[PDB]
Design an enzyme around this catalytic site. Structure first.
Site, PDB file in Angstrom:
ATOM      1  N   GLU A 127      86.087  90.502  37.515  1.00 22.89           N
ATOM      2  CA  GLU A 127      86.842  91.726  37.784  1.00 22.89           C
ATOM      3  C   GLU A 127      87.688  91.562  39.038  1.00 22.89           C
ATOM      4  OE1 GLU A 127      86.916  95.125  35.927  1.00 22.89           O
ATOM      5  OE2 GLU A 127      88.664  94.401  37.049  1.00 22.89           O
TER       6      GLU A 127
ATOM      7  N   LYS B 112      79.373 101.272  25.836  1.00 25.60           N
ATOM      8  CA  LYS B 112      79.658  99.917  26.298  1.00 25.60           C
ATOM      9  C   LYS B 112      79.181  98.886  25.284  1.00 25.60           C
ATOM     10  CE  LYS B 112      81.688  99.840  30.392  1.00 25.60           C
ATOM     11  NZ  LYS B 112      83.080  99.335  30.493  1.00 25.60           N
TER      12      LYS B 112
ATOM     13  N   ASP C 108      82.647  91.469  33.886  1.00 23.87           N
ATOM     14  CA  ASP C 108      82.875  91.713  35.313  1.00 23.87           C
ATOM     15  C   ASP C 108      82.406  90.579  36.214  1.00 23.87           C
ATOM     16  OD1 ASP C 108      84.088  94.258  35.243  1.00 23.87           O
ATOM     17  OD2 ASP C 108      82.180  95.097  34.597  1.00 23.87           O
TER      18      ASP C 108
HETATM   19 MN   LIG Z   1      83.006  97.092  34.009  1.00 22.15          MN
HETATM   20 MN   LIG Z   2      85.884  94.635  34.098  1.00 22.85          MN
END
Ligand SMILES: [Mn+2]
Ligand SMILES: [Mn+2]
Ligand SMILES: [Mn+2]
Length: 201
Positions: A85, A139, A113
């Protein structure tokens, strides 16, 4: 009390590095930080959680995970986490590629991430203003990577993680939850919280 601007909140309460990355992130995806201001703050928050998740964690000279909160981690230590990320599209996928063909771990379909060198898995971090279980399921259903580990934080202090495996010690995750609490309280004092919470949709 008086109503503050989210812009002021973001610039005053997040590190400039985080803000700049969030701005660059929104630009890449065609979103305007000056209009989608709640999203702007959410991106900053998420980005900070990702960095805090990775902070202080190393793999030592024996290959065991350790925490070093001092300023000087001896040179032989290796960062436990790769941070995916906060990178532009090309670099993020480059990193993912550099991880996969290396560690042999298979390639995900969405950018995760982090990568955990200890647990040998990618991590998707979630920060939600809603119920953790709902957000977790959303998610999971989106990525269905199966190998990608999901870890959700809510602003009420609840967490949910794949297979009830929370990866980090209690203190590390406590630092994150303390920060989220601080963000929420400060937003509330500026009369920004109610809208921010309701904005997640
Ligand atoms: Mn995330
Ligand atoms: Mn991400
Ligand atoms: Mn270092």
């Amino acid at each position: 009390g008086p109503l503050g601007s989210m812009e002021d909140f973001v610039r005053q309460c997040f590190n400039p590095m985080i803000v700049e990355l969030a701005e660059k992130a929104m630009k890449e995806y065609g979103e305007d930080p000056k209009i989608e201001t709640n999203k702007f703050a959410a991106i900053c928050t998420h980005l900070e959680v990702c960095f805090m998740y990775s902070d202080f964690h190393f793999i030592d000279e024996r290959g065991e995970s350790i925490i070093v909160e001092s300023g000087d981690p001896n040179a032989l230590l290796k960062h436990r986490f790769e941070i995916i990320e906060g990178r532009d599209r090309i670099m993020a996928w480059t990193v993912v590629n550099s991880i996969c063909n290396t560690t042999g771990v298979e390639k995900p379909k969405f950018l995760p991430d982090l990568y955990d060198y200890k647990e040998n898995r990618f991590i998707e971090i979630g920060v939600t203003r809603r119920e953790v279980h709902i957000y977790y399921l959303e998610k999971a259903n989106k990525i269905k990577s199966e190998k990608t580990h999901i870890h959700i934080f809510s602003f009420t202090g609840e967490e949910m993680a794949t297979k009830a495996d929370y990866t980090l010690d209690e203190e590390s995750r406590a630092r994150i939850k303390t920060r989220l609490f601080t963000i929420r309280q400060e937003m509330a004092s500026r009369s920004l919280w109610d809208s921010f919470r309701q904005s997640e949709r």
